[PDB]
Amino acid sequence: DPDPMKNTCKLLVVADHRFYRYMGRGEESTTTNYLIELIDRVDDIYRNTAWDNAGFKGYGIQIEQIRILKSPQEVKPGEKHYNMAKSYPNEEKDAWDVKMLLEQFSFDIAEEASKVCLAHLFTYQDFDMGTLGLAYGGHGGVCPKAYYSPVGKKNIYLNSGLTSTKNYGKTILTKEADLVTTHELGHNFGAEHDPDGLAECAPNEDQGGKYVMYPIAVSGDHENNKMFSQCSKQSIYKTIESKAQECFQERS
Ligand SMILES: CC(C)C[C@H](CC(=O)NO)C(=O)N[C@H](C(=O)N[C@@H](C)C(=O)NCCN)C(C)(C)C
Ligand SMILES: [Ca+2]
Ligand SMILES: [Zn+2]
């Protein structure tokens, strides 16, 4: 039975210096309005989903805090930070290696991440070969789970993910950005990618197209695009059932 007191995953939303400059036009109001409206549209998808195809619905997400990093993080030589001016490992590239960026963000935000259901980084960098985001889970996801980093020499938490709103040299459509964050939060909620081998979970274009957990970002105009497949629902249903009592809160 859904507990109305434990149905919301509260988020720490972080906008880095790239997002602030290129999406927020160097303004706090523009930056926060974009993120507030995006999370609210993503929340409508989650909240209206019946994970068991019956009454197990009303689970969603809400912003607890928006951290706005206005300028790059100054670093000492050899030191790295997710908000530093240069990309890593190749400073000549517009973007970081996406996996290394998610690991770095998780390391730098560890203290704050331990106090929230999820932390999500919003950036503006053109990841190699069309990548839009990355997230733990679907080994992480909703509710902070510690991982001792031998390189980092401390515990980091795997309740993180990231979204970039830049792809192939331009700002993606808001309809596309909504799907990126929905997909990444889907991994956090426990969903894996929809496989081609299960037609019910990866339909043809005339059968409504692909669902949100498909590995390929494929347009945004098809019926199924903004919905979770039955494969995703089964995985997320099992996650919510064991994780809601652990870190979910009452909807504000
Ligand atoms: C929201 C999408 C589904 C996220 C995934 C990555 C992923 O599955 N992260 O959780 C992605 O970036 N997919 C890319 C993608 O489909 N991007 C599109 C927009 C693209 O740029 N087209 C590439 C065509 N050669 C890949 C990595 C497959 C190239
Ligand atoms: Ca890209
Ligand atoms: Zn994915």
From Swiss-Prot:
Q: How is it modified after translation?
A: The precursor is cleaved by a furin endopeptidase.
Q: List S-S links within the chain.
A: C9-C117, C143-C247, C201-C231
In this protein, the active site sits at E184
Q: Which ranges carry the Peptidase M12B domain? A: 7-252
Q: How does it assemble?
A: Interacts with MAD2L1, MAPK14 and MUC1. Interacts with iRhom1/RHBDF1 and iRhom2/RHBDF2. Interacts with FRMD8 via its interaction with iRhom1/RHBDF1 and iRhom2/RHBDF2. Interacts with TSPAN8.
What is this protein's name? Disintegrin and metalloproteinase domain-containing protein 17
Organism of provenance: Homo sapiens (Human)
What positions does the record give for glycosylation? N48, Q230
What is recorded about the domains? Must be membrane anchored to cleave the different substrates. The cytoplasmic domain is not required for the this activity. Only the catalytic domain is essential to shed TNF and p75 TNFR. The conserved cysteine present in the cysteine-switch motif binds the catalytic zinc ion, thus inhibiting the enzyme. The dissociation of the cysteine from the zinc ion upon the activation-peptide release activates the enzyme.
Q: What does this protein do?
A: Transmembrane metalloprotease which mediates the ectodomain shedding of a myriad of transmembrane proteins including adhesion proteins, growth factor precursors and cytokines important for inflammation and immunity. Cleaves the membrane-bound precursor of TNF-alpha to its mature soluble form. Responsible for the proteolytical release of soluble JAM3 from endothelial cells surface.
- Expressing tissues: Ubiquitously expressed. Expressed at highest levels in adult heart, placenta, skeletal muscle, pancreas, spleen, thymus, prostate, testes, ovary and small intestine, and in fetal brain, lung, liver and kidney. Expressed in natural killer cells (at protein level).
The protein's induction, as recorded, is: In arthritis-affected cartilage.
